[PDB]
Amino acid sequence: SGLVPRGSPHLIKVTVKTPKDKEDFSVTDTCTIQQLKEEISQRFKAHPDQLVLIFAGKILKDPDSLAQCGVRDGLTVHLVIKRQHRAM
Numbered sequence: 656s657g658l659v660p661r662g663s664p665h666l667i668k669v670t671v672k673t674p675k676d677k678e679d680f681s682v683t684d685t686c687t688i689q690q691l692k693e694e695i696s697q698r699f700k701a702h703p704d705q706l707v708l709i710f711a712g713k714i715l716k717d718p719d720s721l722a723q724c725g726v727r728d729g730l731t732v733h734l735v736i737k738r739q740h741r742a743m
Contacts, residue, residue, distance in 0.1 A: 667728040669721070671695060671708075673736060682721060684728075689717035691732075701736055709733040 665685070671678050680694060692703040708715040710724055710732045726732060 667721075669726055669728075670731040671734050672731050673734045684722050685720050687717065688715045688719050688721075688724070691721065692717070695734065699736060705737045705739070707735040707737065709735075 665683050667682055667684050669680050669682055671680055676699075678698065680691070680698070682691060682694065686694075688708060689703070691708065692706045695701070695706055695708075696703050710726055710730075713724075715724055715732070
């Protein structure tokens with residue numbers, strides 16, 4: 656409608672799969688791993704340090720963008736959420 660499209664190139668959807676859960680995330684394609692960790696913390700209610708993200712069998716590193724990692728629209732990132740200890 657008008658000059659504005661229904662969708663965008665910058666707006667992808669990636670599946671975050673844990674051993675127990677499967678959750679979709681709308682993300683920008685240039686979103687960094689650290690920013691995705693933050694989005695995931697807010698979704699699962701976890702601290703980012705709990706989070707381990709894997710794609711193409713590689714543990715993903717905070718500064719990289721999703722695009723640099725090879726994560727594209729409709730693909731799956733694996734997530735392990737390290738369980739909090741009972742005590743410090």
